[PDB]
Design a protein around this ligand. Structure first.
Ligand code: INS
Ligand code: CL
Ligand code: MG
Ligand code: MG
Ligand code: MG
Ligand code: NA
Length: 287
């Protein structure tokens, strides 16, 4: 090696939402294993201009690697272009975008797989017959587009399955509750509420509980957060899909360190796993 300077990794997470908080905690835990590195853990607070300013700062500091969880798929491209031009490795964590193969590596999970797994199980529970209400996450996130696409690919496989409602609750619990309330007030018949993440599903459950209709509707989410697993244990949540926050966070740090140390790195695609009341205790154990 040509020097003995402390190395530095700059991290910009989109925000600290329910799932991403677990990922960030896992990044911080893994980062503690590398005493020859300093880490800068920054939070973009869902603001792409702030994320761009964080990345520009990392470039100007000449950090040894950058980890980004992109706020949106448009600015993601500008970020990767800029960091590539700077000659600094850039690891993309958890959120992908069109153009991701220009980054140094991607660490995350394949979104359409979670929508396919989720809706396959809901279809089984419905015996392939039912009116489906889909809760989109944050519009234009790849996870939103592709979880819903996976849902629809299963729905299109079965003539008795039909999407009757589709709206966004912005990956948010309170918005999920409001959306469910509005859907209930529309009088539309719903057999399953299928949400792009667990927070929205948990919001829908609160609304369904409030009018005594939770036993009449199948509810599904994605992430298998501890909150979701508790709802499943209580018999409120029928389906979720484990996304490995700890694995994504620890692996992103490991890959960034490798790249910072001058090694070529590669993607890490961590599988999604179906969670049902039959295997829920196995996923509690992951926390
Ligand atoms: O910020 C979102 C949010 O945490 C979702 O709940 C999770 O499924 C997505 O992977 C993540 O990008
Ligand atoms: Cl949240
Ligand atoms: Mg030297
Ligand atoms: Mg590559
Ligand atoms: Mg129910
Ligand atoms: Na159909």
């Amino acid at each position: 090696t040509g020097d003995s300077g402390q190395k530095v990794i700059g991290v910009s997470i989109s925000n600290l939402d329910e799932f991403l908080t677990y990922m960030q905690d896992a990044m911080k835990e893994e980062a503690a294993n590398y005493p020859d590195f300093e880490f800068i853990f920054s939070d973009a607070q869902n603001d792409s201009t702030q994320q761009m300013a964080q990345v520009e700062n990392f470039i100007s500091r000449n950090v040894d690697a950058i980890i980004v969880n992109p706020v949106d798929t448009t600015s993601a491209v500008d970020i990767v272009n800029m960091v590539n031009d700077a000659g600094i490795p850039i690891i993309i964590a958890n959120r992908t975008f069109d153009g991701v193969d220009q980054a140094t590596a991607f660490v995350g999970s394949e979104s359409i797989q979670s929508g396919l797994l989720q809706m396959e199980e809901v279809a089984k529970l419905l015996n392939n017959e039912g009116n489906i209400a889909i809760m989109d996450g944050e519009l234009g996130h790849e996870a939103q587009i592709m979880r819903t696409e996976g849902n629809k690919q299963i729905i299109e496989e079965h003539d008795g399955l039909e999407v009757v409602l589709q709206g966004t609750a912005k990956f948010d619990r309170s918005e999920g509750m409001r959306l469910m309330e509005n859907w209930l007030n529309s009088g539309t018949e719903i057999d399953a509420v299928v949400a792009n993440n667990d927070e929205m599903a948990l919001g829908a459950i609160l609304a369904l509980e409030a009018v005594g209709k939770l036993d009449d509707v199948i509810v599904a989410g994605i992430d298998a957060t501890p909150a979701a697993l508790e709802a499943m244990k209580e018999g409120k949540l029928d389906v979720t899909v484990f996304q490995d926050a700890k694995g994504q966070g620890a692996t992103s740090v490991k890959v960034a360190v490798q790249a910072a140390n001058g090694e070529d790195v590669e993607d890490a695609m961590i599988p999604y796993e179906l969670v049902t009341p039959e295997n829920v205790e196995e996923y509690e154990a992951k926390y």
